[PDB]
Amino acid sequence: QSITTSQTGTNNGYYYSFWTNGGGEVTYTNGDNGEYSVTWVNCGDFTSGKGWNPANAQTVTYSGEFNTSGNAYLAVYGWTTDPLVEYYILESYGTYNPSSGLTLLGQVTSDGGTYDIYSTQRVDQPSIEGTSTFNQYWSVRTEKRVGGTVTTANHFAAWKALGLEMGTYNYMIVSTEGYESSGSSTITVS
């Protein structure tokens, strides 16, 4: 049922990943089908969500509720390997825009919205491969929204068209991530 330390697995047909670096209390609960719920209060950093692994650039439809007082992200979130990349298609966030001070590369239109595209390097940082160096790519929706359809293939295509290198898909989830914040989300992925 409800968990408080990091854990990955499969649940009702969905890959799920719950990662926390231990700070505050974060509680993660798998629901039915593609649903998950997470609630956090004064967290450190954590990421949580359902999706697929390995992913296949799914057109993802999600719905639900995401709220925070502080710094949190709602994004289609995953990784590639060879090369190693961490990426976000950021649909909503709280008090902090994570593209702040990142390199802007362009804009992409998809699913009725506009996203600005950014890249940064993460150097000797925690990863799905242990401590590693990798690029981190963002599509940040120019207006926040919680629910709709994300055609992740359009983002991946725009990133590569603009010159970003992408590897083989590893997991891809609809992630709630919190950072020094409190809040809650409940999200159904399909």
Author numbering: 34 to 223
From the paper:
Xylanases (endo-1,4-β-xylanases; EC 3.2.1.8) catalyze the hydrolysis of β-1,4-xylosidic bonds of xylan, constituting a class of enzymes that are critical for the degradation of hemicellulosic polysaccharides in biomass. The overall structure of TcXylCΔN17 shows a β-jelly roll fold, as seen in other GH11 family xylanases. The two catalytic residues, nucleophile Glu119 in β-sheet B6 and proton donor Glu210 in β-sheet B4, are located in this cleft.
The model of TcXylCΔN17 was able to be built from Gln34 to Ser223. The thumb in A close represents the close form (closed active site cleft), while the thumb in B open represents the open form (open active site cleft). The RMSDs of the Cα atoms between A close and B open were estimated to be 0.55 Å, and differences in conformational regions were observed between A close and B open. In contrast, the cleft of B open included 7 water molecules and a network of 21 hydrogen bonds formed between the water molecules and 14 amino acid residues (Ser49, Thr80, Asn104, Tyr110, Trp112, Glu119, Tyr121, Pro131, Arg155, Gln169, Trp171, Tyr204, Ser208, and Glu210). On the other hand, in B open, the region from α-helix to B4 (residues 185–204) inclined at 5.4°, and the loop between B5 and B6 (residues 114–118) and cord wrapping thumb (residues 131–143) were spread at 1.4° and 2.8°, respectively, to outside of the enzyme by comparison with A close. These results suggest that the tunnel has an open form in apo form as B open, and if the substrate binds to the active site cleft, the tunnel (close form) forms by replacing water molecules in A close.
